[PDB]
Amino acid sequence: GPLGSMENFQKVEKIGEGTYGVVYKARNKLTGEVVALKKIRLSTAIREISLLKELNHPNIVKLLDVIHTENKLYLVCEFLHQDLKKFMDASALTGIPLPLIKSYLFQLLQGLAFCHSHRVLHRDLKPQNLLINTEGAIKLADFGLARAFGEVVTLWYRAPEILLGAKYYSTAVDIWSLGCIFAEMVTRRALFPGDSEIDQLFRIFRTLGTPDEVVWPGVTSMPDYKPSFPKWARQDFSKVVPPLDEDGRSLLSQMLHYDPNKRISAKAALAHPFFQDVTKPVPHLRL
Ligand SMILES: */C=C\C(=O)N1CCN(CC2CC2)c2cc(C(=O)OC)ccc21
């Protein structure tokens, strides 16, 4: 078995918890490069991961290297300046400026359209794995594998078809997660902050109404659907995202359609009128 493969990286800071391991800010001992290092404590996933090394896009965090040594798996990523959760917390008193929200949403839709055009799903979009830099960019990170391998799981961004037991995800799950993040940037509160699967499901139901066959054909036959679910009425989007103009509200409503077949795709969303005046502002970052 392999050893000595990682003495070329000196760990500088602990910067989060990825989808399968802890992530450090590290410094390439040899080249001086500053990177983000995911350590997965341990294949068909050795190939599914290495395919992500080819998935290069301005709005996807660059996967530089996979280092499989000594019953541990390392992912070497480019390092970005801040993640969206921290920036949202830092902007709690003022709010992220709406043009910057719109830039960030637009860029993430571009990243997803690229990912989805390659039939790659993220599966677990969260403010914590959206990374931003000083230049105005935002990038997708920590893609969830179809094969899980290797804190507490956040459920707040989970699409309802996942919660309802759907065995096969579509790209629509990522559009749902990003809609939730969009709303959270605008209102400065999480849209659906459940603390269990059923609390998550029912928080969605209380806001968007309990889905039935009318709005979601097939919902009542899903593995975890129960006829005994409470029947809540749908609230109005004027109540859910007050600061958002009608263009933003209509886009968000389309990202949160219950039926994954009705949910807007990333590429369709790019053409939505909400982006006809999109710009690329600079965040104010305290690093
Ligand atoms: C290559 C490391 C990697 O896989 N990721 C995804 C995990 N994270 C953060 C994790 C969600 C808490 C992460 C962060 C960065 C970064 O630059 O943070 C400042 C880069 C890559 C990765």
Residue numbers in the entry: -4 to 37, 46 to 153, 162 to 298
Could you give the paper's own sentences about this structure?
As a method for conducting allele‐specific chemical genetic investigations, non‐native cysteine residues can be introduced onto the surface of a protein, against which electrophilic probes are developed, such that chemical inhibition can be achieved with a level of selectivity that is typically impossible to achieve in a native system. The high degree of active‐site homology within the Cdk family, has meant that developing Cdk2‐specific inhibitors has proved elusive and, as such, selective inhibitors of electrophile sensitive Cdk2 would be highly valuable tools. To generate an ES Cdk2 construct (Cdk2(ES)), we mutated the gatekeeper phenylalanine residue to cysteine (F80 C) to enable covalent binding in the active site. Additionally, Cdk2 carries a surface‐exposed cysteine (C177) in an allosteric pocket, and this was mutated to alanine to facilitate compatibility with qIT, which relies on the presence of a single surface‐exposed cysteine residue.
